[PDB]
Design a protein. Structure first.
Length: 109
C-alpha cells in the first residue's frame, strides 16, 4: 500500500553482510535480508551492492586482497583457501565496505 513515513536508506555497507564459512573455501558474505534499509538501497538503484575489500593473511607472510559485490541473492566469496601453498590462513580482515554505485562512462578518447 502506501506510507506517510518515507526515509532514505542510511545504512552502512558492512551492516548487511554476514560471514559464512561454508561460502566457497574459506568463506564469503551473503545478504542480510533482515535489514529493510539496505535492501531498499539496492532495490531503488542507489547502489548495486556492497563493495568490500577483504584481506586474507597467510602463514607465508603474504595476503590475498579481494574486492567483490554483495547483492540481494548474490554471494561474494572471500578470495582464498584454508591453505595456500600449504600455509594456512591465519587471519582475515580488510578494508571498510562501501556502497558501490555503477557509473556510465561515456568515452571521449
Amino acid at each position: 500500500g502506501g506510507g506517510n513515513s518515507e526515509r532514505p536508506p542510511s545504512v552502512a555497507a558492512g551492516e548487511c553482510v554476514t560471514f559464512n564459512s561454508k561460502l566457497g573455501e574459506i568463506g564469503g558474505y551473503s545478504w542480510k535480508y533482515s535489514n529493510d534499509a539496505c535492501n531498499e538501497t539496492v532495490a531503488k538503484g542507489y547502489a548495486i551492492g556492497v563493495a568490500m575489500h577483504r584481506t586474507v593473511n597467510y602463514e607465508g607472510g603474504y595476503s590475498i586482497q579481494s574486492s567483490g559485490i554483495v547483492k540481494p541473492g548474490s554471494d561474494f566469496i572471500m578470495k582464498g583457501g584454508k591453505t595456500y601453498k600449504g600455509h594456512k590462513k591465519v587471519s582475515a580482515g580488510g578494508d571498510t565496505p562501501y556502497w558501490y554505485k555503477l557509473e556510465h562512462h561515456h568515452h571521449h578518447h
